[PDB]
Design a protein around this nucleic acid. Structure first.
Ligand code: NA
Ligand code: NA
Length: 326
DNA sequence: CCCACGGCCCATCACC
DNA sequence: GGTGATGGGC
DNA sequence: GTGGG
């Protein structure tokens, strides 16, 4: 499908999703609207009626009614109204800052802080994460071309190996499935010295080296197993690269490839694979694959030494990341 | 009618 | 000060 | 808001 097919509808539903999440604080309605937008976005025909749309899984009575109003009038009265609402549109907007969620956005707007410029004038009311989100507001909303992701991966893999050649690092996400662009960089890290049965500095060493070569520029959060921060490719006399979001997670070696599988996705592939695993008497989560007994009691985690090991357990042919869209 | 809709790390708040 | 809750993000 | 038990 292409946009102009049903883009008016899917844009409408996405906008409604955002207000549910950010203003109404109704996360399950947010996801309902998103699910409806997704299934409509994949529908190979231009929708003629709400009833037609209601045949799709995830589109119910209320969304059908909204589609009817949109098709007849070219708008939704409720959406048009909350759009002109100074308070609600401001709350919705501020959540675009990384670190500002529905609660902070509401609190800010309640005390007269509505805009980016208002945040800029009120730095002492922002925590560290929020200050960084504000600083890179525009950059964080840009997508990352695959060519830059490859340059970023080059640096990550090199520096990781430099710290300890026994580290294993994998860049996951849509990038690993071959996407032409990414929203951020997601790095999974492990080391043979770190198992589920098993130093408390393995993640720190890698973050520190990436900071020393001035690739990592800011830290949003950092613990013993999870880093979230900011990075930037070195500038060529040419214009600087945008700052990018990068996550780095340390995973025990015996749970690594379950992790790599999960964080490679897609979300639909994951759901389908876990569905088929149940079929075969296995349960798969982010960490392990375990056999299910005859009454449904999960046994010990099975040995996994590759992604293929997982596919083999559930009698499925290994599918390359490229072939994991669903 | 009524409940699920992912779960967990990290930063920070709420309270003791 | 310590412990658990909450917000945020993915 | 939707689906399903
Ligand atoms: Na439906
Ligand atoms: Na935000």
């Amino acid at each position: 499908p292409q946009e102009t097919l049903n883009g008016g509808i899917t844009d409408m539903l996405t906008e409604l999703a955002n207000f549910e999440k950010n203003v109404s604080q109704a996360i399950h309605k947010y996801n309902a609207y998103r699910k409806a937008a997704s299934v409509i976005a994949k529908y190979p025909h231009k929708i003629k009626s709400g009833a037609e749309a209601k045949k799709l899984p995830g589109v119910g009575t209320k969304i059908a009614e909204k589609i009817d109003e949109f098709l007849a009038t070219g708008k939704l009265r409720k959406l048009e109204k909350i759009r002109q609402d100074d308070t609600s549109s401001s709350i919705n907007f501020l959540t675009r800052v990384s670190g500002i969620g529905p609660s902070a956005a509401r609190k800010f707007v309640d005390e007269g802080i509505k805009t980016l410029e208002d945040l800029r004038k009120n730095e002492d009311k922002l925590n560290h994460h929020q200050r960084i989100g504000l600083k890179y507001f525009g950059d964080f909303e840009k997508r990352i071309p695959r060519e830059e992701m490859l340059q970023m991966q080059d640096i990550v893999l090199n520096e990781v190996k430099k710290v300890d050649s026994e580290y294993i690092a994998t860049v996951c996400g849509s990038f690993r499935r071959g996407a032409e662009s990414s929203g951020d960089m997601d790095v999974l890290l492990t080391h043979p010295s770190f198992t589920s049965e098993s130093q408390p500095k393995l993640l720190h060493q890698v973050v520190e080296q990436l900071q020393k070569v001035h690739f990592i520029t800011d830290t949003l959060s950092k613990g013993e197993t999870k880093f979230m921060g900011v990075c930037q490719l070195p500038s060529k006399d040419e214009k600087e690269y945008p700052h990018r979001r990068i996550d780095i997670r340390l995973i025990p070696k015996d749970q690594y490839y379950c992790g790599v599988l999960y964080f490679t996705g897609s979300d639909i592939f994951n759901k389908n694979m876990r569905a088929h695993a149940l079929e075969k008497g296995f349960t798969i989560n982010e960490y392990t694959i375990r056999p299910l007994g005859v009454t449904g009691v999960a046994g010990e985690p099975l040995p996994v030494d590759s992604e293929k090991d997982i596919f083999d357990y559930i009698q499925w042919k290994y599918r390359e990341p490229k072939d994991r869209s669903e």
